[PDB]
Structure formats: structure tokens, C-alpha cells
């Protein structure tokens, strides 16, 4: 399973840790920000582009609050990014929203919790079915 990761200056540290974690667990990681991005807009849009052009369906964005990477990346037509700070949304957003990426706020979420969030997100598959109508609606928007 491929995973696209990216981060700005505030999220870089955790991104580096998560990268190590992912590699240790046989995940093929595509880091779009070997060096911290100028800001969360650059990092979030970079992850989005790599994701929407790759055959990967999992991505993780890192910044100080998460809010920014999602706000910016969601402006991209077809993109669906979920800010995640707890363990229920971690999997539900993948199951129902097919979230193409999740955003983690390093100033909001501690490392140990982030890992539980991340692993739950990665282990969950989009359920499709009735949920597809909402996804069709979102991908239709600007």
C-alpha cells in the first residue's frame, strides 16, 4: 500500500517520525517534502497533486493545526481531506468519505495518538454503496 506524506515547517518533525514508522511497517512511502514546505498551502497542494496523479489512495498531511492543510487542499476539485484529531473519525472518514488524505495538527495531536489515528485510517477501506452519492456530489464541486 502506498502512502503520500508531506509537511510544512511545523509538521516536519512528526512527518519524519511517521515516515520511519511507515517504512518499518512495509509501507511504500512517497514523501513530497524532503525539506519542509514554505507553508501548509504548498505542502498540502503538493500531497494532493502527487495523490491525484498516483494510484495511491492514502495520504497524510502535517502542519501545526491540520485545519489549514485541509482547508487549502479541499479547494482542489476532486480532493477530500479530513482533519483528524481522534480515533473514531480516523476510520469513519475513510469508510464513509473515502478521505483521500488526512491532516494532522502537530500542535494539537500528540505523537502516540497520531500513530493510532494514522494506523486506523490506513487499515480502513472505503465502503462505497450508499456513501457514493455524497462523494459524487463533492467531486462535482470546485
Amino acid at each position: 500500500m502506498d502512502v503520500i506524506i508531506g509537511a510544512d515547517k511545523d509538521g516536519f518533525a512528526m512527518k519524519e517520525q511517521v515516515k520511519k514508522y511507515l517504512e518499518e511497517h512495509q509501507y511504500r512511502v512517497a514523501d513530497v517534502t524532503p525539506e519542509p514546505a514554505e507553508d501548509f498551502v504548498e505542502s498540502s497542494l503538493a500531497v494532493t497533486k502527487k495523490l491525484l496523479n498516483s494510484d495511491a489512495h492514502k495520504a497524510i498531511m502535517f502542519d501545526r493545526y491540520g485545519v489549514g492543510s485541509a482547508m487549502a487542499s479541499n479547494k482542489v476539485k476532486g480532493m477530500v481531506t479530513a482533519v483528524v484529531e481522534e480515533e473514531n473519525t480516523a476510520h469513519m472518514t475513510a469508510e464513509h468519505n473515502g478521505a483521500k488524505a488526512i491532516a494532522i495538527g502537530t500542535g494539537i495531536t500528540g505523537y502516540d495518538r497520531a500513530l493510532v489515528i494514522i494506523q486506523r485510517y490506513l487499515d480502513t477501506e472505503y465502503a462505497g454503496g450508499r456513501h457514493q452519492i455524497r462523494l459524487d456530489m463533492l467531486e462535482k464541486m470546485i
Binding site: 485545519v67 485541509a70 482547508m71 482533519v83 473519525t89 454503496g129 455524497r134 456530489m137
Partner: protein, 172 residues
């Protein structure tokens, strides 16, 4: 001040609690979200709230769904909107002070009512404070999407999807 609020069927009861609180605080509320708990779709209401704020019918917007992710994302995908998905007071205050977010999204099924009240209150109480830095960020965000006049102010935008739903195309 006018606040537009919306929601999907999963958190109508949480919406009602926030609606009562807003009115008690003196806000005028424009309830757009679904009014009952019959299965419906979050993008419809997220878009309604977004246009109210974008067209000036409301000053700010608040949207919720089970996780808040669906409706807040739908709200964000509109001209003139900066929607912040915040299940905590800290990121909500940041959203208002630094990104001048005009739509707040919350996960009604993951956040307890008492904390939802706190998030909403903190968000509303916060004030945007311009800085050369966040002005540059806001500018970038406002120019990412490509405007689509066919979507703007078109309430029938999701009709094709709604018909397919009626025809059973989206069965489980």
C-alpha cells in the same frame, strides 16, 4: 449578527442545541441544514450554508455531520468560503484569528455537546487579526479553486445525483 447553520440527519439533535444557544446569545439564526432525521446528504446543506455566507445573507456559518468532515468539505468547496474543520477549541480559535475562517465545521457524533458549545463560543468570540503572514496564506487559499458559475447560486446543482438516489442507483 447572522449565523447560518446546517447539518445532515446524523446530528440534527446537536444542531438544535447549538441553534438554541446561538439565539439565547442574541444571534439571528438561519437554519438550512436538514430539519428532521430522515437519511439525507451532507453536501446539500454544506452548500446552502456556504452560499448564505458567500452572498452576505449571513456573517458566519456552522456545519456539522457525524464527523463534520463531509459537510465542512462541501462548505469549503464554494467561492468566498474558508471552512475550518475543528473538533477542538484551540484550532477553532486559530481558524478565526489566523485564517479568518467564515464557516466552522464540527463532528456532532464525536464531540460532546458541552465541548461543541465551547468550540462554537470560542470561534465566535475570536476576531481575525491580519498579519503580513496570514494575509498571504488567505490569499493563496482564496485562489486555489476555479470558479464555476454553474455551481454558484444553483440550488439544483445536485439534482442529477438526487434522481439516481431515487432510482436506487446508490443501493448498498
Amino acid at each position: 449578527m447572522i449565523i447560518a447553520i446546517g447539518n445532515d440527519h446524523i446530528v440534527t439533535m446537536q444542531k438544535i442545541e447549538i441553534s438554541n444557544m446561538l439565539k439565547d446569545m442574541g444571534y439571528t439564526v438561519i437554519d438550512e441544514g436538514t430539519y428532521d432525521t430522515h437519511r439525507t446528504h451532507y453536501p446539500i446543506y454544506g452548500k446552502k450554508v456556504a452560499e448564505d455566507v458567500a452572498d452576505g445573507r449571513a456573517d458566519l456559518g456552522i456545519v456539522m455531520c457525524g464527523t463534520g468532515i463531509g459537510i465542512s468539505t462541501a462548505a469549503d468547496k464554494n467561492e468566498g468560503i474558508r471552512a475550518a474543520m475543528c473538533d477542538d477549541v484551540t484550532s477553532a480559535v486559530y481558524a478565526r484569528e489566523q485564517l479568518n475562517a467564515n464557516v466552522l465545521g464540527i463532528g456532532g457524533a464525536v464531540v460532546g455537546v458541552h465541548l461543541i458549545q465551547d468550540i462554537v463560543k470560542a470561534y465566535l468570540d475570536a476576531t481575525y487579526k491580519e498579519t503580513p503572514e496570514n494575509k498571504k496564506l488567505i490569499d493563496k487559499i482564496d485562489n486555489i479553486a476555479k470558479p464555476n458559475p454553474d455551481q454558484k447560486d444553483n440550488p439544483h446543482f445536485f439534482d442529477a445525483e438526487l434522481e439516481k438516489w431515487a432510482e436506487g442507483v446508490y443501493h448498498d
